[PDB]
Amino acid sequence: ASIIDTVANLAKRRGFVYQSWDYGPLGVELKENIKRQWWKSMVTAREDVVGIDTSIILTAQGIFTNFANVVTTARKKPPFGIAQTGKSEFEQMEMEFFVEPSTAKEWHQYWIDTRLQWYVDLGIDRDNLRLYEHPPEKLSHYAERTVDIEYKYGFAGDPWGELEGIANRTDFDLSTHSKHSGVDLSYYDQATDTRYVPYVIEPAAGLTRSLMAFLIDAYSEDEVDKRTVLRFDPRLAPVKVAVLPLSRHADLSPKARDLAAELRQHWNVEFDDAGAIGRRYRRQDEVGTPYCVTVDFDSLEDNAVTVRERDSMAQERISIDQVTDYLAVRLKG
Amino acid sequence: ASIIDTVANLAKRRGFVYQSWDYGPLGVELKENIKRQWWKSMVTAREDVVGIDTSIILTAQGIFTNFANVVTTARKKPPFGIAQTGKSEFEQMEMEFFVEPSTAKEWHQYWIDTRLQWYVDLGIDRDNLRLYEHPPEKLSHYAERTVDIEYKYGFAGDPWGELEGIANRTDFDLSTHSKHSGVDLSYYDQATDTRYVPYVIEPAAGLTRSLMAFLIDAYSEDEVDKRTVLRFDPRLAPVKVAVLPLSRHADLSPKARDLAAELRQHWNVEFDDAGAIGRRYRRQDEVGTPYCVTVDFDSLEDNAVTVRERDSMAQERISIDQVTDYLAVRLKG
Ligand SMILES: [Mg+2]
Ligand SMILES: [Mg+2]
Fold it and tell me: Residues in domain Aminoacyl-transfer RNA synthetases class-II family profile (chains A, B) (predicted)?
């Protein structure tokens, strides 16, 4: 079986996806973590980018139409961006970056690079990412230049697939909307330049494609005794912590559950006392849980817990009073 | 003008909503904060509730169909819940809580109370919330009992409106799906009870209605010199912090912007040096920013900043090194 078939079998088995395709309990968490990271690094982390959410009663058009409004209430001037999570019925994280046409090309390259680095910063092997520029044959009527980030999914024939497209649509969008709506959307310069209709650089990433890329790239099988493991970035892992009492003994449970409640205040935690500890470690590793917290009888007097890191499996026993902080620093976000 | 007209004018003016209706830059942040709080207190904060996301190609049905799968991969037994953000084209935060029929009524009351408290815990005046039980005339064919939480929006005639419905749909849903799909979804008991098809308690809250209720309830006008203010809970405010240098002097900006960058790592921050400080304080108050951080020339040597709290307007000057923590403790989430 191919890598894709293996990962899909795992995803169905552990509830990442359910055959229908619908996202199961882990799939929703991974999807929302991906969306949160995209919004964080695109909207809230950038002063020149603000968000918007439009209705698609039956998508990027909803941004252009509201351009004027955004310029007024948000008090933004080019270069600046408007981001959105558009239900293209698959979701798509898209952004329209309005810039002076003179800089259009420079900005384009910027967003071609930044976006790529984004994926790399979340744990994707750069060797599994590449750039594919559309020739004039592909270039849409409005797009002067189009560059697709492509990920090595592992298909038959061509193993690469589009993951995100960054296009230079020029001034076609705003000009069309101005002509059709009878409203001037021009930012004619009165400061060291001439009149222009803002050019648009459009990064658009299919959320499903992003999740598939992260899931496939995180897969690993390392020894002997083989171990299937999703090496997710901590910010993307569906489950951040696993509170695993050493046994079902009624002494460990009342304290391990209190610790799990403390942790659930902040992160999504999974509590499991079923069976042997090694099986539970393998369970958590299969779904990329970055840390496991084990409570044993020695904790009833020593008042500590064993923290096991996913990839290395190295264990460190630390005071139960500090666990939260010890995890926060390591979980980020 | 009515309270609703006033709040709507403010929302359009400040970009909460744009006339089309679409959410502007602040509206998206408020909406996502509401959704995050709902998911946090319903899914990640409860071990007996897990999430799911289904496709609605043209909503609660998608949950029932996947019930079996969830019971297998999630390893859950009744009483337990499955939550979802269903695109009913308006979004709706819904949950299906499967329970043994014997407890169905008790659990029902629980979710009638808990949900209500949820709103109250996020800053809604309990006096503006009420319960409305549907008579048998209203009770749907499948619903034995139906209770709507209603909020005092301020309409004409009847000023109340549905905000969230909590229904006891009995075993109609799973029984229908079993008959139609040829799959047994029964949890026939083999432990101190008899055979049953899990009963369903359904809390469903319209996200738009929730956002409208929060926006309306947060509105206030307090003196003299009147001050319009959205008294949002810190977890719901679209903007958590406002870095406001005392003036555009080139000495304050390079440091205030560094502080704003530090804060943007964590929260959504708004930087504004335009005009007088009082006007900027009023701007931030109009949209419910819980804290304003002012940098003045005294900071260039004292290395401190003035933190102004929204409601009280009380100011406290604290070291710029501690600001993040000082805000974290006060912003929650
Ligand atoms: Mg921004
Ligand atoms: Mg849960």
Answer: 5-245
